[model samples]
Target chain A: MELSFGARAELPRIHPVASKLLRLMQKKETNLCLSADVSLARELLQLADALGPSICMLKTHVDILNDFTLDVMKELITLAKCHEFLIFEDRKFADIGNTVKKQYEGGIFKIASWADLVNAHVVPGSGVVKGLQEVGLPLHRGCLLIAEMSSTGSLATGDYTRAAVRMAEEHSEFVVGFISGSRVSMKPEFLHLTPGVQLEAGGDNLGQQYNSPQEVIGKRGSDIIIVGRGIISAADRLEAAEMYRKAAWEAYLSRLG
Target chain B: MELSFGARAELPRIHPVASKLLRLMQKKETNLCLSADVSLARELLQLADALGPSICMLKTHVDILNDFTLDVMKELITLAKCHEFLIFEDRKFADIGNTVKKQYEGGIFKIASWADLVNAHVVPGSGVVKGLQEVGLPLHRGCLLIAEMSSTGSLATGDYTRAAVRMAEEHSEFVVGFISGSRVSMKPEFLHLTPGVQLEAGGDNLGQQYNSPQEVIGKRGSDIIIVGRGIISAADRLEAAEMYRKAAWEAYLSRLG
Candidate 1:
């Protein structure tokens, strides 16, 4: 096997929120981060209610949900409390420090209040990460820098990924992980997560390339594997969720050995 | 003194939205894009009403607006029509294609319906531009590529800027311009915009570096000067806006001579 940050839960020098997430995944024995790309609040909540036990974290695009409201977010937070899984609002914030401060804390989304994890692009540099940290650090929340994207022909080039790693090193307390491939850092504390995971590998027409959970975790050194429609589009989502949950957790466990 | 696309109003092979914006600036004789960074709906609408006549485009961060609603956006759009200005929603979208397709057209903002101009980071590559154009091209809306940032030590380096120009050129039918520097070596037909323009050069103590309108338009080769705090934090915004209008218009004229 290849070298990595070892076990996710045993990693050191990470934010408390990241520690909480890693420990939660270790205790639950599920390394699946379900991406709920649903457009309706009812579907999102129903999926959470059904598949909550099998997921370590839930990634959401809150902007796409048709009937999104503060009450809906409140319910989602309550559900996470019951499920003991973290919530990551994929806000993908990319703006100046002060403007991002307002976007994170205020607005209809108010991402800082509910989500345990948030992410931002390094296009605007450390100022944005500092701004996000100012809002998230005190609240025991953590952020992720998008070092590389999973899509084909992505502009997250090699140099850009290295810059993101350097930016993360500069803001160690706030940036706890990265959304990257193998080109990211292996500091043993900053978790490496990757999307485009499924049981079967293939390419989508929209330029999405898939990797198996084993490939991402064991071969590519991804600590966490985010699987979207792979499980959601199955005939029995509950069974499909357990399948991926088992696959990803086993991959992580074997990755350590 | 320097060559550009030879007057913004005469650029060929551009989207109808870009054509409309260029002609509006030509008629108004002002290339000032007033960035209303206000958080409240009342203040945002008030600034748009009072200052819309002096600027060709009013850029907004609608997500930061505390009391944003569809009706508030409707009134803002109406005022822009009355004052003969365009709305540029600085969403700074950085997501996958399908996901951004939903974010751009749906949610509370419904950006495609109101804002004539929108923008996205080139971090996700050409897929994002193509996805955004799929929704905007039908509505006759144009998109800007964020090739660089005005903040100190931003991660938008030379290669990143070049990749952005390539990405925008690939989708030129829908991409109207770039937020870049003269060193990016972009085509003449695409608009070039620069933020951080102030009457007097200074720093914000928050990493924002300011450039005079003359410096951006005449020296750095920015076609439109986006002024945020410079005009918004003025003693009298009406007079401040006219001063910027005159200064920015004169700079554009001088650049062409």
Candidate 2:
């Protein structure tokens, strides 16, 4: 679906891309989305192979994958395309204008060359927007402006959050507000992506928080739900995944009426 | 010969563990240091294999390396111990007290678990020191304070630099200055770890500025030279590495004398 670019206007109730996705899953009696945090190449590809059919997009921290070669990326992309999924590279690109320019142009991954979407930190400078545009990639870009971070001692206090919201509104096309479930009511126009959502309050051995898909969707209207360890670490991988998918579907359907 | 913490009358370096390191690198004849920017697990193990006999430390942007599995890290540490190479995670962490804590604690890397030294952006915040110490890593846990930056548009303006230096001096015991070859003359007491040292400029293709070891040492008086793309991207890797070793040794001898 064509993404909206404006402030205060209510976004189209249905995301064409996300809507078609939901329908396809409904027909197949499967989940709306599946994500794997493959910090390793083998896990990444394996997750791609196993979870590809179940997931709409694969979330990755490209730097963490040890076997991220062009061949591997090509294979992943082939699988993703075959499975009708997108690749999200979560590099959190925060560098000077020049460095950022080179990073997209000449650096490793050559993000401009392949990624379907990228996560960029807005602190570097405004030129970040222009840099991505100039890269000549027809990719859909998303910015995770650090509005209200999830941690307790987060420096994104009220003032920073307010200011960041304004910037996100101004740069609505490039930005997607990063807020917890608590403040999801504020900016309905921007796609609010909540990360701390988890089934458990305290995360596993890794500090990544988890939440049931139903709880996250019910509490915080996250356009896209990102679950890492929850799916990967579930005791019965497919069963745990099915449980989350069912909850996510129920939550999305409830939002319709 | 023992590594002296450089003219103890200068400033008491905190984290005796790290102070001993700064001392050791200075005393070594054929000083060897590893730049840990490996993208794959195999590369890390390969580096660990080569770490013996020649390397003193394996420096890494732990967050950037994709395959940071427990098994991989264990192997890496094993290699380091076998070769007597300490592991330095070059995070260059910049954030408020809380987020910084999470970054160390939350991420897959969980650097606090096992990192010999960590590079921190010493912005105006007391929480940084407190947070690092709170983790129970070590008081002398090599906090490489950002005295200056290598990039052209670094936030370290003259006023900021002077102010940072003042703050650094006050907490001299807790602070270790980070000076690029460009700013080496600014503070001779601080261990200048020059990073942009490259065989070729790489035409800014890489996110680094290139400089020869001779230039960095003879002119800038850099103590520990940090080379990233130089050795890693070279065609004849060993030969390229030997060239840097020769340059580093010759320069160190000249600087010491």
Candidate 3:
């Protein structure tokens, strides 16, 4: 379904069904990243079910699991639909045109049929855009572009950014840009997702860089914060969820002049 | 658990587990991209059931998934232990200093606790080396660093390649440089994994470019040809599996001579 926010508006006006869902997330201001471990399906579902109300979307990386069947995906989708949340199959798909098409259409994920959105790297030329469109899917249906990465030594360098922007502008109407917290001010066309967000000062023990929702929203003005650990890794998940919600809203309001 | 390959005088000896599995895949000659899509507890067991000898390493993009529990991860470790398959968590982790530690340890997909290998992007000076040391997972635990991507306008340009090489060299003993077909030659020490390999010229309707396994191996001498579609989307999955097996072996033997 198409979710248009008029011609020049910044706020997203989603489909009625999706609008309520997205708005719920915006209201709660909680966008969670369920970074599932390489483990069991049932366990994953249980955790997801618990976090449903607090999450805006459930992002699944289909490659790490031991079990990714149609039945499991159906169950998760059902849960998400019931919760009024979107499903993002984080494939980070970066392949050639034909293969990419097959990946989305025929593979285990079959993202074209399943996901509300799918992450793709747009650096593979314009074919990324054409391939997704050819599937009869809406542009927003396939989250086409990634701008900056959350990590330290990313190759989405300045040159790549220039090329990405050029391509993104041509296709920005229906794409999501993965931008760095530092660079969000530079580009305003597409929706930006910052992945390495954490409240910890030095970031997580892994390679992710940290950012408080307040700090990120206050400084970067991030449209959506793709948080992996701030909630999931907390001692009290639900409480952490509440904190994240408050932080996101506080940041959003702080952005207003 | 470290899988040793003894010493190689001239030819490189891959990890025994990786070698045996690669040999089987070579027998099939099926172009494959191992979907590391398990992010739950019971799902890992199910995925283990699906891990046939013909498959490649289970590929994953870790940051996107969330349901990580210690019990589930330990179960995954046991499964991978029994199955003889490698885990390639597509973490693409790139961070400075101790932050990488938290991203791996603090998240659900705790690489230090489990994962045999990981997909990392080379960034920040000596970031990867520091990460490897901090984790203390294994010497055989491969770090596939992104050097060049297969997409159209990748940020991994000429300068990035040179810099990436300089950094990779410092940790050459542990790191494998991943480059697509369009860039640098696939050499030893840095085993190349070409991501855009395909039987068809264009697989998706999108702008992703495509190439055959033979072209990458014969022309590029690539060590591993990562195929996401040649088998996953085939009408006859088993038959498609055999194709990649035969071709990869033929190509490898030819290069050996």
**Candidate 2 DockQ, CA atoms:** 0.08
For candidate 1, the TM-score is: 0.96
**What is model 1's interface RMSD?**
1.3
Q: Could you give candidate 2's per-residue lDDT for residues B1-257 as a string of tens digits?
A: 31233542133434464455555554444444657565677887886676444555667755445455667778877886665666777665554343455555544566766676666654424455445545534433556655555553344445545555565555555556564444433444455566667755542432234677788766776666666567777775566666777787787677556
Comparison by lDDT, 2 against 3, better one: 3
Docking class of 2: incorrect
Per-residue C-alpha lDDT of model 1 across residues B1-257, encoded as one tens digit per residue: 24433254565666666677877887878888999998889989999999988988899988888788999999998999999988999999888777788899997788888989999998876778777878888988889999889987787877878888888888888888888654354466678888878989786755678888888887887888898888888889889999888988888788787
Which candidate number has the best DockQ? 1
Error of 3 at A123 (Å): 4.5
Give the best candidate by lDDT.
1
lDDT for position B107 in model 3: 36
Give the per-residue lDDT digits (tens) of candidate 3, residues B1-257.
21111112123634343444455444444324455443354544554445435455556544323454557557766765565555666555544444454455543345655666665555444555567656644535656667676766555658766666666656655565564463263344355667776666774434446687778776776666665555656666556655765676566566655
Candidate 1, superposed: residue stretches over 4 Å from native: A1-12, B1-7, B183-186
- From the highest TM-score down, the ranking of the candidates is 1, 3, 2
Residue B35 accuracy (lDDT) in model 2: 75
Candidate 3: residue B89 Cα off by (Å): 12
TM-score, one value per model: 0.96, 0.56, 0.63
RMSD of each: 2.1, 9.0, 8.3
For each of the candidates, what fraction of the native contacts does it recover? 0.48, 0.01, 0.26
